[PDB]
Amino acid sequence: ARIFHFNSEVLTSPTMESTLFKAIQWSKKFGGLIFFDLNLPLPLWRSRNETRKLIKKSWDEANIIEVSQQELEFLLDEEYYERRRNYTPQYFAEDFEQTKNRRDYYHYTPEEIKPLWHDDLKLLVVTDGTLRLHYYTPKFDGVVVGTEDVLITPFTCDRTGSGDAVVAGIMRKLTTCPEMFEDQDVLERQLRFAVAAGIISQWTIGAVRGFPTESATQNLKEQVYVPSMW
Amino acid sequence: TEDEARRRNWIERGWAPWEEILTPEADFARKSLNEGEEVPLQSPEAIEAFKMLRPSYRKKKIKEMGITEDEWYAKQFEIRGDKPPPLDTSWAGPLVVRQIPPRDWPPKGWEVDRKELEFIREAHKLMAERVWLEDLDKDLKVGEDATVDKMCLERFKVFLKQYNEWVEANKDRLEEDSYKYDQDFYPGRRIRGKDYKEGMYELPFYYPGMICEGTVTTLHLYQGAFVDIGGVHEGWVPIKGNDWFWIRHFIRVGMHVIVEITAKRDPYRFRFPLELRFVHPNIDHMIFNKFDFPPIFHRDGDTNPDEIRRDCGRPPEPRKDPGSKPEEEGLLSDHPYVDKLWQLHVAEQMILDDYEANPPKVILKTSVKELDLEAALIERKYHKLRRNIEMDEYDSLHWRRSLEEREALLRDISSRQALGLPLEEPGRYKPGSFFSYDDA
């Protein structure tokens, strides 16, 4: 295996946690990359400090990390970003775009992310659903603009499992396109494939039942994005 | 006609022919559509506007005029039409000043030496002294005779000593209140954070009548010009609406002016605590739109409209006139406590009855510890009642109170009618278009 993938649910079990770090040792010995898909279970949302201590060892062993926007803000400071989103200028907007009162897609700076960065981390992805994919590398950072449409099928839409399709789409392109780690333009184009997979996954009841094929994902990507973004 | 309507729009509706800086496409649209729909453009303006639709032609035209591109970009933002007659500000004699401490020193809730304060307050009687221009020459001190040590400024120096003590003890608290109350900075708010510099004058340093030199920092089309007069709050000259159409030619950002303080207000309630007027240049003849009242904040703790209008000088909320004279109404004698006495009376009587027998709804709980059963039982065994008599004596006290108010009101009416004083609260009670058992 070239990518070793695990969630934080294994950290809630004393047996699996010991087994997990032996699996990581073997995978690294054989050159595999470690993918930490956080997906915090219910107990790990109680307090920031306890969760950070619980995940720190597994966080440091990971080469690729995927977290949601809510998980990232919870791990750094939940109240600061909530206050940031609710701020409204008193007299006039600082720019024309701030007048439109659009949804907040704040891109975290690499200095804000710095408490969570370590030496072995190659790629950090922060997902705002399928709407935004913020990516962070040692050399560069940026955001991929996505979209969602569950109102196109109101009676079959089900968001469960769409986070897994995005992660699976990332791993599909990482293994076959190793230059994603070093080329920003290549990384953005390949991440749009993961966005398309997440969109299709939300159109069916049931996670496994609705997981999309490669050709369907590639078709949707070319339909949604203009040809220059393929 | 099309002369009074234009004047009517200017005066009543605030119309002004503000410049419209158009793109080449917009400029071509207005020049070409005046000719027809699909016709050969004939007017030299529309023909030139057709040529200007290509920026390559504009660059060639710009080079032939010898100017740069940015200069051409700046020439389109130029005021069109005629210019107002240039200002001619004349000084009404020399500017003669005194160093007079503000009358409102010290601030409320700040304790100073009352002996020093009375020494300070002696300078306020100097305003009554008369000065004639025929007399500012007889004993004029100049040069070496006009150094600062030669002047008597003892009363102003005592004010400065108290002012500096107040500044060092309240500077941090005032900045903390600015952040608590004012979310964003705006001209007229307290300068704070990195923009604050030590030595900026606090509000108690200013008073109406002072002459200041300052620079114009902000022009607002609906508010006026804001002037930095060396304080932690910028001054405000109220100018709004059509007046800016001509005044913008003379009042510019960054220019030095001489201003006079006309009012100083509380920054918590009023948006612009320092109100100014321009002394140099004089633009009194150009200002026609006036603020009825100084603008205020409507803050979190302002829930009662009647309290808000008392904090400023604004009129009461108008009401329909009742159409009845208060001095002709019947007197009131129903004491409000009688309803409570009645409940106690009923509670005692029902407790007495139980004592004998066994020795849309509203419920009124009554306590046994607020009843006087020792007197009630003696009255019960003896047999209106005492409680009924107690209700009449409370009614008599209330009736006497109403009688004395009415008697004072009748005398008050005669005095006010003779002296031309209002009978009702001014602003209240606007007029229309503004919006038998006993004998048997």
């Binding site: - | 703790g301 009647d306 209330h398 109170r401 002296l419 009702e424």
Partner: protein, 104 residues
């Protein structure tokens, strides 16, 4: 708001009045008004001087969420055109006098 109700509504108070001031005003000849726990709405048509002898009253101006509290020993001047609710929670006793224009 920050401004006290007494300042806003021009309710002059002289808490802890000396006996000399009482005799200068002739309070001993003023009429007596008393009450128990109740609520009294009133709109003052003339100024009224009130000397509280017992108890306390909390005065809520019309539309207000705050109150003014006056205790026994205070001399209160309720201004003309004031509208308020007077609240009592215990036995209360006062001596009052209504003042027309000038007068006192």
């Amino acid at each position: 708001m920050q401004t006290p109700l007494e300042e806003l509504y021009n309710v002059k108070v002289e808490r802890k009045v000396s006996q000399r001031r009482l005799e200068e005003l002739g309070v001993s000849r003023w009429s007596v008004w008393k009450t128990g726990k109740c609520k009294l709405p009133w709109d003052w048509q003339v100024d009224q001087l009130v000397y509280i002898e017992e108890g306390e009253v909390r005065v809520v101006p019309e539309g207000s969420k705050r109150f003014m509290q006056f205790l026994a020993g205070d001399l209160v001047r309720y201004p003309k055109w004031l509208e308020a609710d007077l609240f009592f929670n215990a036995p209360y006793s006062e001596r009052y006098c209504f003042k027309a224009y000038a007068d006192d």
